[PDB]
Design a protein around this ligand. Structure first.
Ligand SMILES: O=C1CCCC2=C1C1(CCCCC1)N=C(Nc1nc3ccccc3o1)N2
Ligand SMILES: OC[C@H]1O[C@@H](O)[C@H](O)[C@@H](O)[C@H]1O
Length: 388
């Protein structure tokens, strides 16, 4: 109906024309980094827990060339970017360090350059494009962080690990966008592989690539086209009260605490507090079950754990919103459905039979009060490079 096609050949083609227009030469490099859907394991990554994301064909592309003048020149063409669409700045030095400011989309690139571990980092000219809906809950900011990082490696190869690069991109998000994210979005955008979900242990940083082949099974992502104020503001608050519980219970994280251990600890925590822990502590177990459900290829089954996720995010972690609750109702008539990412708006993810839709999308559009947009998501590759 209103399914947005990933248009990735078109997206690279656009970036290249805009580059040749803007800088008077053919760009030497293309990189991409995907946005992401989390299938299951919400608000667990910063509780040293488990997540089961996959990477999307929705991506951010940098096309660009090194410079010799030690300065960075950026053009973005992504419609929703705040103005101006261009920014230049000198590379940071021991004296001058990059600072967050205006425009906001540039803060992601600045952050990553500021924390890039390797040297010498030369200047560069780049066009930035993205088919990741900006602020839609599919990690537009992680795709731009990891796209930038991936471009910096072509200018000055790091001798790093996947985790060190994820932490760089994550620090850019903390310091330059004031968003105190865990490691999920960066990790999946680095490490995603076509036809696989990526089970991440956010305690050990051991990762599994779980085949998601079977073409009988689809993932429908539905953009609510809503972002509530509470989003930016309430994520840190949830994180802070996850620390208080861990503090009180002598646990270095909520990973190390067990549902039986917290049931017996109702006395020692807020009703807000216990409700947030029964989600996390719970929400870890079900991601482990889901993982072991995918592997066994039971796609009805971890419906339950997915719908169970949603209920718990909505009733216990209190980070759903009426729009998310009702896209779920609309779809859940499909193996399953739940909010995905940080919540207070953005997208749901629905695990249906490929054949089922586009009845899901006749029905969601015609039973969602807001504006639905759809992606039918193949599990995608992570960060990529194409020499031009
Ligand atoms: O305002 C917010 C708060 C919610 C989270 C968030 C945003 C904005 C910040 C900059 C203006 C647009 C919206 N952008 C992103 N991600 C992003 N990915 C991009 C890829 C290419 C170009 C620009 C990009 O911005 N995320
Ligand atoms: O599942 C909740 C997730 O929210 C994301 O939007 C954030 O970037 C992740 O680190 C994770 O905390």
């Amino acid at each position: 109906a209103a399914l947005r096609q990933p248009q990735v050949a078109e997206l690279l083609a656009e970036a290249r024309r805009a580059f040749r227009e803007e800088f008077g030469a053919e760009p030497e490099l293309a990189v991409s980094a995907p946005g992401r859907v989390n299938l299951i394991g919400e608000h667990t990554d910063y509780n040293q827990g488990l997540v089961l994301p996959m990477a999307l064909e929705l991506m951010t592309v940098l096309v660009g060339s090194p410079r010799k003048d030690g300065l960075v020149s950026l053009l973005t063409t992504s419609e929703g970017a705040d103005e101006p669409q261009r920014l230049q700045f000198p590379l940071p030095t021991a004296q001058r360090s990059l600072e967050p400011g205006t425009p906001r989309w540039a803060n992601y690139v600045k952050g990553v350059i500021q924390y890039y571990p390797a040297a010498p980092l030369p200047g560069f000219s780049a066009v930035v494009v993205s088919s990741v809906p900006l602020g839609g809950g599919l990690s537009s900011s992680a795709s731009l962080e990891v796209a930038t990082y991936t471009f910096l490696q072509q200018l000055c190869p790091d001798s790093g690990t996947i985790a060190a690069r994820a932490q760089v991109c994550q620090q850019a998000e903390h310091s330059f966008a004031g968003m105190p994210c865990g490691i999920m979005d960066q990790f999946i955008s680095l490490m995603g592989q076509k036809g696989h979900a990526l089970l991440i242990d956010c305690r050990s940083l051991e990762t599994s690539l779980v085949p998601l082949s079977d073409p009988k099974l689809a993932v429908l992502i539905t953009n609510s086209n809503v972002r509530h104020s509470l989003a930016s503001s309430e994520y840190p608050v949830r994180r802070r009260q996850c620390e208080e519980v861990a503090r009180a219970l002598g646990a270095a994280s909520l990973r190390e605490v067990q549902l039986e251990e917290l049931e017996a600890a109702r006395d020692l925590v807020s009703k807000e507090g216990f409700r947030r822990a029964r989600h996390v502590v719970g929400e870890i177990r079900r991601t482990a079950q889901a993982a072991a459900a995918l592997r066994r290829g039971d796609y009805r089954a971890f419906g339950r754990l997915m719908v169970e996720s949603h209920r718990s995010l909505r009733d216990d972690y209190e980070v759903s919103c009426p729009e998310l609750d009702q896209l779920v109702e609309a779809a859940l008539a499909v193996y399953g459905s739940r909010m995905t990412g940080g919540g207070f708006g953005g997208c749901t993810v629905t695990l249906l039979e490929a054949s089922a839709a586009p009845h899901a999308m006749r029905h969601i559009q015609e039973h969602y009060g807001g504006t639905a947009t759809f992606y039918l998501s193949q599990a995608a590759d992570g960060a990529k490079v194409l020499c031009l």
